[PDB]
Amino acid sequence: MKVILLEPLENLGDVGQVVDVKPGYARNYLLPRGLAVLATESNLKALEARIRAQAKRLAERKAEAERLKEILENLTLTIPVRAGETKIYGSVTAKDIAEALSRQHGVTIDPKRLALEKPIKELGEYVLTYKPHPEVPIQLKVSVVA
Template identity: 30%
Template sequence: MILLKDVKNYGKKDDIVEVSDGYARNYLIPQKLAIVATKDDVSHLRVRQKKEEQATKEDVAKVEQFKKQIEDLNMSFALVVKNGKPFGSVSLTQICDRLKKEYNIDIDKRKFEKHDNLNKVGLYYLKIKLDHKIVATLKINIEGK
């Protein structure tokens, strides 16, 4: 049988599994969860899986290139400092807006992993979750003025 959807205890979509005749005839086929695996169906499945695998490799390469582009950046922001204490903070919205305006990089602020408040002078490393479980690190330098 070729599974058309995930089936608990048997496998995920597009897996080729062996099941009892009764289970296939009485449950999987009527529920449209699986089809009988003929030679043609199996060969079509293999071709489609190879195409999907190639597309995934190309997508991962694009994401890796995007990661490198992000990691090459070194952004600077300024905070007002009075009597040695900085006032205000730098928000993720400000960072995202600046990335969009200056570098034409569009990142949703929800992609940033949790971090400390950016309200002190110093260098911060922010982690950004990209597709395919790839994480990029953005350097943010906060200076006093």
């Protein structure tokens, strides 16, 4: 009796996988507890209808990140600050790097998705890490100047 696991279950399989069990275990245990559904044909394509979306919806998340890694790795956000010789009087935060992008290049960016643990207090060229979607990270070149 093939059925569709809706929950990972001890030594049966992973949710969405279709495995074989004795009928009694199915219609008297797994089914009334929501733990699975019978692997009919009606709710068989229904399962293929979900693996289809998730495949394409997760690839669109990878495709939209690339429609910004191309941009951000081909530019330089230049930040004019007030500083003496090396060290800044204020500082430049992810919030600043965010609004400064929207100012020049107009790209909207999530500052919490930018690899900055300490605000920046010293002039120079920086290349930081931007991770919008994991496994698709961006290296942003950002020039701070007086």
